């Protein structure tokens, strides 16, 4: 007992971590949640018209999302 106690402890730890039902992909999976509406509100208020030089790395995606604008209208 007193000589295999740790070997038992990490064996149980490793087996439970590897073969638990909660980690059947290597990680604990959760459902995608909703954010606060104030988060989306702050994002659009900050980017505004896309005029400040901070948002260039966003400019390529913003204009790229123009391809998907017809879905948003529908």
């Amino acid at each position: 007992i007193a000589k295999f106690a740790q070997k038992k402890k990490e064996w149980l730890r490793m087996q439970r971590n590897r073969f638990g039902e909660k980690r059947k992909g290597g990680f604990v999976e959760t459902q995608k949640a909703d954010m606060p509406p104030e988060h989306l509100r702050k994002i659009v208020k900050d980017i505004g018209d896309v005029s400040q030089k901070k948002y260039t790395s966003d400019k390529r995606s913003y204009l790229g999302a123009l391809k998907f604008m017809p879905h948003a209208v529908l």
Partner: protein, 190 residues
């Protein structure tokens, strides 16, 4: 001198070697066909020989191709096969069903991969993200270092494809480059 009374004998030239062969019982370095001084990084092709020991210029013919490229370069390729002395009975049979089906499978796989490539190019898949974004593992035994020859630890690499933003256009403008030169032109066997 004959074997084994070559004691005191000490050769000076390939004359003294005769038709060659160093004498192991003489404790001096021997050169039955002459000393090699050096080779001061010439850019020349290495002179090679063919199956029966003659100097070969098909190296010039084959320079810049792969090993399995069929290149006709000799008068022998212009003599009808049934008159080539090296052959007596030529097997002119189309391959069997198993070889044809093995060929059809191999080529159907390669062409199917190219068809999937062409289809995914012709129809970009609306959103270019994949849900099945699993990881590859790579075992990675390293070589030494830039400057160190000490051995160091074996490496497990977890490679995942990066989550790219689905709204992004392609990053780089394409360019016009002239097409490169052909593969080295074959000998004209007229």
């Amino acid at each position: 001198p004959p074997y084994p009374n070559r004691a005191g004998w000490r050769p000076r030239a390939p004359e003294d070697f005769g038709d060659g062969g160093a004498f192991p019982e003489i404790p001096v370095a021997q050169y039955p066909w002459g000393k090699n001084d050096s080779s001061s990084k010439s850019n020349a092709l290495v002179v090679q020989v063919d199956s029966e020991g003659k100097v070969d210029y098909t190296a010039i013919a084959r320079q810049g191709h792969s090993s399995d490229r069929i290149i006709h370069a000799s008068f022998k390729d212009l003599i009808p096969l049934r008159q080539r002395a090296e052959a007596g009975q030529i097997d002119l049979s189309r391959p069997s069903k198993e070889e044809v089906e093995a060929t059809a499978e191999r080529t159907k796989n390669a062409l199917a991969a190219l068809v999937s490539g062409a289809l995914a190019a012709q129809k970009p898949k609306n959103v270019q993200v994949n849900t099945k974004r699993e990881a590859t593992f790579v075992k990675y035994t390293p070589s030494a270092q830039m400057g160190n020859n000490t051995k160091k630890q074996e490496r497990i690499i977890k490679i995942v494809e990066r989550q790219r933003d689905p709204m992004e256009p392609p990053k780089f403008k394409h360019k016009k480059i002239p097409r490169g030169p052909p593969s080295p032109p074959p000998p004209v066997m007229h």
